[PDB]
Each structure stands twice: as structure tokens, then as C-alpha cells.
């Protein structure tokens, strides 16, 4: 039974370095060219590096995205593949997979490398003024934009939890910045507007920040 188990992944500040190891078993590791492949969160696959088997002398090959800052190596006596990652960039953040052979016939479960300042950041909260354009008759959608916070999670309630009907709080996007943003929207009666007060209550416990943002019509 061919196994590949990746290790060494973790959090790391931009410009930093890290070493990954993939431990192989269930085959003559020495006989195989080996690969490193990566996958950024919510994105496709990108080939990173490969290294020949023992008989071809273990020559090494790299994507142009990692030339000169990653080094691939191997210890055939330990049946371990290695990837030294130096001078790490934010765009290197991905799950790193070990894959066997030119055939890429077996893949490990991978390991997460996250390249980020792990800087606690509270959100900015902006009101999303009601619009009736997209909603059913007699109703309007209004919301809150919860921008640029780290780490997860935030919670959002409406009118201190009293308003639950028609609430849709969306999953967060992880931005290229390394920060999260999300939105919460509520559909309410159009007749209620400027009679009824709407406030989104945002809690970001990791930064000890709470915001009650009043959302009024334009």
C-alpha cells in the first residue's frame, strides 16, 4: 500500500522560510521520480518541483514561480522527500502535496503552508443601504459589510438578536491581503424603513472588538 505523508506545514511570516518533508512507503522510493504540487485555497493545482530517481542522479527541476528560493531533495535511505522553502511569499500559501512519479499516480493528503503576518486586526463595518431592486414585492434588502479582519471568526446579529427572519450571513472571503471580509444581508418590509431601526451587531472576539452599526435608508 503506497503511502505519502506530508509534514512541516504551518504559519510563517512573509520573507520567512520553512522545510517540508514527505515520508514515503509501500514502494521502492529510490526507483521513482517525485513531485511537489501545491493548491492555493479555493484555487486549482500548480506544479512546483520534481526530482529524478537514483539512477538518473536525482537532478532537480522547478517552476519559474519558485526558481532560486525552493530546493527539492531526497534521502533514499530514509525514503523521505524534502522541500526547503526559503524567502516565502504570500502567494506561496497553499496545501503542498507529495506526488509519485511522472505518472503522479499517488498523492498525499498534503500539508498547509500559510504565508502571512499573523497580525490580529479588527474589522471595519460599513452599512449596506436598503435596495428593493432584487427582492420580492414590498421588501428591501439591507446589510453590513464586515471588512479586513484577522483571524476568523466574526459573528453578526441583527437588532441584538431580535431580528432573525430573512437574515443571510455569507461565508467569509479570504483576500489576497491575507485578511477576511464577509457580508450579512437582511430582507425586511419596505414599509418598515425609517420607521424601524436596523443595527448589525458585529463581534470579533479575537481582537476584542464589537461594533453596532446602524443601517439607514439612503
Amino acid at each position: 500500500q503506497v503511502q505519502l505523508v506530508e509534514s512541516g506545514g504551518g504559519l510563517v511570516q512573509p520573507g520567512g522560510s520553512l522545510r517540508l518533508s514527505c515520508a514515503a512507503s509501500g514502494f521502492t522510493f529510490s526507483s521513482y521520480w517525485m513531485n511537489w504540487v501545491r493548491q492555493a485555497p479555493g484555487k486549482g493545482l500548480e506544479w512546483v518541483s520534481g526530482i529524478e530517481n537514483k539512477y538518473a542522479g536525482g537532478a532537480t527541476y522547478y517552476a519559474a514561480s519558485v526558481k532560486g528560493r525552493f530546493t527539492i531533495s531526497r534521502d533514499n535511505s530514509k525514503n523521505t522527500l524534502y522541500l526547503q522553502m526559503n524567502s516565502l511569499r504570500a502567494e506561496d500559501t497553499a496545501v503542498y502535496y507529495c506526488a509519485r512519479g511522472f505518472g503522479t499516480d499517488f498523492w498525499g493528503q498534503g500539508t498547509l503552508v500559510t504565508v502571512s503576518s499573523a497580525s490580529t486586526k479588527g474589522p471595519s463595518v460599513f452599512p449596506l443601504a436598503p435596495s428593493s431592486k432584487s427582492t420580492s414585492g414590498g421588501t428591501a434588502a439591507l446589510g453590513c459589510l464586515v471588512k479586513d479582519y484577522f483571524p476568523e471568526p466574526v459573528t453578526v446579529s441583527w437588532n441584538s438578536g431580535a431580528l432573525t427572519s430573512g437574515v443571510h450571513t455569507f461565508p467569509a472571503v479570504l483576500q489576497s491581503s491575507g485578511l477576511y471580509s464577509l457580508s450579512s444581508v437582511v430582507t425586511v418590509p419596505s414599509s418598515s424603513l425609517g420607521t424601524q431601526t436596523y443595527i448589525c451587531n458585529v463581534n470579533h472576539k479575537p481582537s476584542n472588538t464589537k461594533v453596532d452599526k446602524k443601517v439607514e435608508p439612503k
Partner: protein
């Protein structure tokens, strides 16, 4: 090099076909991988063989298009599929294709586009917010426009996530300077789902 459709859907029992195009892919070996949500990729073992009994997974690779054919598609085939080939610099991958096996009737997206708040503009930023809900299959393509020109910079889009009702939700954000926002007549969020497009437009005016 390698281009795949962003998604393909098929009814249970029917044949799905996932194309993968690149110049002269016909003269390279085309690899296929299956990746379920949260799992690592796995190699799709497929027959090139002309005939015999029909194969659950078959390949053809001819001219500039390679195609994975899945016969007797069932729910457990649902995954993202990727093609690849060996190029001169290393392995090139296609962008991947979400395969949905239809477990309920198609449902079209509800789309709400919000402009930058006055408050955000006062803090010298601007975000357009496109919220997309109640769709099935869970695959959309979101394109943004400044006036009539496609805009790619500053766009952040989520992967679709399943709602309580087994339909899907997604969100897209366009980050702009107040100056960019104010210098166009309009911006539009275009949401494509199963061949249909919904375009919502907002204006600083």
C-alpha cells in the same frame, strides 16, 4: 496551455464529458485527477482502449482537445476534475471543472449588488458587494465590468458553499479607489450559471 470549462452538470445515469484544450494536446499524454471537497486529488484511471464493455472512465485525446468521459455518472463522481500534461518547464494543469450530478432540479441565482457606502468612501476606500444565493448546481462564474470593460484587478470571489436548503451561496467583492469608482458611469456584477447570465449594475450617480 490547458483550458477546461469551469463546470459540467449531468443527470444520474447519463454520460458526462469534461474537455481539456491546449495547442497540440493530442501529441501529449493527458492526465486526469478527481478531487472531492476537502480531500486530496486522486488519479483517474481511464481506458484509451477503443472498445470492449463500456468503461466507467474513458479518455480520448485528439487534435487540440482531450476529453474525459464518465459513463453511468452517479452522485459519488461529484468532484472537481483537473487535466494535466508534461510541458517543457514542468507539469501544466488545466483550471479544473466542477462536476455536478443533478440531485434536484436546477435553481437560478438570486443576485444583489450593493455599491460603496458613503462611509467607506469617506475612509478613502470603495468596495462593491455582489451577493449570490439560492442556486443549484453550486457553480457560478462572476465577471465584473467598469462601464463595458471587463475588470479583473481587485476581485475576490468565494467558492460556493451549501445553504440549509441544499442550494448554494457565493459572494464576490470588487475593491476600488474612490477615484476609480467615481470616474466611470457604472459598474456591473455579471453572474453566469448553467449558460444563463444575470447582470446587476450600480452607478456613483
Amino acid at each position: 496551455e490547458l483550458t477546461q470549462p469551469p463546470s459540467v452538470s449531468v443527470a444520474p445515469g447519463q454520460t458526462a464529458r469534461i474537455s481539456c484544450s491546449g495547442d497540440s494536446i493530442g501529441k501529449k499524454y493527458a492526465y486526469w485527477y478527481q478531487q472531492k471537497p476537502g480531500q486530496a486529488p486522486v488519479l483517474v484511471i481511464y481506458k484509451k482502449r477503443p472498445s470492449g464493455i463500456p468503461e466507467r472512465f474513458s479518455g480520448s485525446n485528439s487534435g487540440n482537445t482531450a476529453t474525459l468521459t464518465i459513463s453511468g455518472t452517479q452522485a459519488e463522481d461529484e468532484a472537481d476534475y483537473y487535466c494535466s500534461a508534461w510541458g517543457d518547464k514542468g507539469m501544466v494543469f488545466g483550471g479544473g471543472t466542477k462536476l455536478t450530478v443533478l440531485g434536484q432540479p436546477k435553481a437560478a441565482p438570486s443576485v444583489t449588488l450593493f455599491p460603496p457606502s458613503s462611509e467607506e468612501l469617506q475612509a478613502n476606500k470603495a468596495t462593491l458587494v455582489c451577493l449570490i444565493s439560492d442556486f443549484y448546481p453550486g457553480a457560478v462564474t462572476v465577471a465584473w465590468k467598469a462601464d463595458s470593460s471587463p475588470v479583473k484587478a481587485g476581485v475576490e470571489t468565494t467558492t460556493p458553499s451549501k445553504q440549509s436548503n441544499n442550494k448554494y451561496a457565493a459572494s464576490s467583492y470588487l475593491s476600488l479607489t474612490p477615484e476609480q469608482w467615481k470616474s466611470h458611469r457604472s459598474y456591473s456584477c455579471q453572474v453566469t450559471h448553467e449558460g444563463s447570465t444575470v447582470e446587476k449594475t450600480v452607478a456613483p450617480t
